[PDB]
Design a protein around this nucleic acid. Structure first.
Ligand SMILES: [Mg+2]
Ligand SMILES: [Mg+2]
Ligand SMILES: [Mg+2]
Length: 167
RNA sequence: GAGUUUGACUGGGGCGGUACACCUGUCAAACCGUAACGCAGGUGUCCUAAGGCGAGCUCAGGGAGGACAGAAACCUCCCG
């Protein structure tokens, strides 16, 4: 039945910078040029002396795309990765992700003002009906025979993009 | 030189301690109450919100994941 078709719920991009300041506000404009929307700064939960991060200090930026624009950014991300992901990239909960080492390959032209940054592409899959565990009125679990496994996630990647999955 | 004062509790007194005004657990023996210089601790503060109300949200931790990134940075899902 068509009520089991795997789809892209959201594409969550993450640029975790080591420190704040001008170095962080440059990465915010990178996600704005790619996702076309204002990013969200993530403050540090705790303080780490070795990492050089203080509590409640913005160190990262993240976005999330839902509609056809999420498939656009994923296609540009999978093109840089040559449409091949390792078998361990797929989580047992049905999701997967990969890392991009430089945003210049995604379609953003390099400029001397802002530096080069690496993103963190993570795709959250789902079936039509996965919203029952997120709504407030009459919330319910998804179900055993309806949640996506690791096998269906890898098979979906080998069919929509015909990607290669290395052992 | 004159007058007066130089606390109390206290296994004598002094020294020490404050059991001297208060709070929690226990002692305490299933109502309450109940002693010892019994036991283990706290108090002379702090807060324009850490008061009041409404709304949304869910925590600790763990599993699986995801460029740098690692036993600990951030993103995601699941259990909780
Ligand atoms: Mg006399
Ligand atoms: Mg006496
Ligand atoms: Mg009693």
């Amino acid at each position: 039945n068509p009520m089991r078709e795997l789809r892209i719920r959201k594409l969550c991009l993450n640029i975790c910078v080591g420190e704040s300041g001008d170095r962080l506000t440059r990465a915010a404009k990178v996600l704005e040029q790619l996702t076309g929307q204002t990013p969200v700064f993530s403050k540090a939960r705790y303080t780490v002396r070795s990492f050089g991060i203080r509590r409640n200090e913005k160190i990262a930026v993240h976005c999330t795309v839902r509609g056809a624009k999420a498939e656009e950014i994923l296609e540009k991300g999978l093109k840089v990765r040559e449409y091949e992901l390792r078998k361990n990239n797929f989580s047992d909960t049905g999701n997967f992700g990969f890392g991009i080492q430089e945003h210049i390959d995604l379609g953003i032209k390099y400029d001397p003002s802002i530096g080069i940054y690496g993103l963190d592409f993570y795709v959250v899959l789902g079936r039509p009906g996965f919203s029952i565990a997120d709504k407030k009125r009459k919330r319910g679990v998804i179900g055993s025979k309806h949640r996506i496994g690791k096998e269906e996630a890898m098979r979906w990647f080998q069919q929509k993009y015909d990607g290669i999955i290395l052992p």
